[PDB]
Amino acid sequence: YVICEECGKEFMDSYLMNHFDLPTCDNCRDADDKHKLITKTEAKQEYLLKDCDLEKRE
DNA sequence: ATATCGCACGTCTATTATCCTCAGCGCAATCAGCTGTGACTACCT
Ligand SMILES: [Zn+2]
């Protein structure tokens, strides 16, 4: 069981946990604004992040 | 002997499913910075 950091309700499997190891249930999944997904190139341009920093930094 | 049916000879029209120019992401062309070799030119105390 995984405890959600937003609502506190324990959940077993969720989309956020499965795809990004984020301890948040689908009920609290704010994919609109808080959990918005962006392309790799856009993130690299905005945050000046390199490939290694996105793949090799623990 | 003269109109009439079978045969042929085409020709107009169509009851109906094709080829062009705009989009992220990763490997390669590009560039600033630094240095190495050689001789040159000069400048201060
Ligand atoms: Zn939750």
Curated annotation (Swiss-Prot):
Covalent cross-link site, Glycyl lysine isopeptide (Lys-Gly) (interchain with G-Cter in SUMO2): 44
Protein location: Nucleus
GO biological process: base-excision repair; DNA repair; intrinsic apoptotic signaling pathway in response to DNA damage; multicellular organism growth; nucleotide-excision repair; nucleotide-excision repair involved in interstrand cross-link repair; nucleotide-excision repair, DNA damage recognition; positive regulation of transcription initiation by RNA polymerase II
Keyword Acetylation (UniProt): yes
Identification of the protein by name: DNA repair protein complementing XP-A cells
Keyword terms, alphabetized: Acetylation, Disease variant, DNA damage, DNA repair, DNA-binding, Isopeptide bond, Metal-binding, Nucleus, Phosphoprotein, Ubl conjugation, Xeroderma pigmentosum, Zinc, Zinc-finger
Superkingdom assignment: Eukaryota
Disease per record: Xeroderma pigmentosum complementation group A: An autosomal recessive pigmentary skin disorder characterized by solar hypersensitivity of the skin, high predisposition for developing cancers on areas exposed to sunlight and, in some cases, neurological abnormalities. The skin develops marked freckling and other pigmentation abnormalities. XP-A patients show the most severe skin symptoms and progressive neurological disorders.
Residues that coordinate or bind Zn(2+): 4, 7, 25, 28
PTM info: Ubiquitinated by HERC2 leading to degradation by the proteasome.
Subunit field text: Interacts with GPN1. Interacts with RPA1 and RPA2; the interaction is direct and associates XPA with the RPA complex. Interacts (via N-terminus) with CEP164 upon UV irradiation. Interacts with HERC2. During NER binds XPD/ERCC2 and XPB/ERCC3 of transcription factor IIH (TFIIH), bridging the 2 proteins.
Family membership noted in the UniProt record: Belongs to the XPA family.
Tissue-level expression: Expressed in various cell lines and in skin fibroblasts.
First and last residues of each zinc finger (unnamed): 4-28
Record function comment: Involved in DNA nucleotide excision repair (NER). Initiates repair by binding to damaged sites with various affinities, depending on the photoproduct and the transcriptional state of the region. Required for UV-induced CHEK1 phosphorylation and the recruitment of CEP164 to cyclobutane pyrimidine dimmers (CPD), sites of DNA damage after UV irradiation. During NER stimulates the 5'-3' helicase activity of XPD/ERCC2 and the DNA translocase activity of XPB/ERCC3.
Alphabetized GO MF terms: damaged DNA binding; protein domain specific binding; protein homodimerization activity; sequence-specific double-stranded DNA binding; zinc ion binding
Assigned GO CC terms: cytosol; nuclear body; nucleoplasm; nucleotide-excision repair factor 1 complex; nucleus
Coiled-coil regions, chain positions: none
Statement: the UniProt record of this protein carries the keyword Phosphoprotein: yes
Record organism: Homo sapiens (Human)
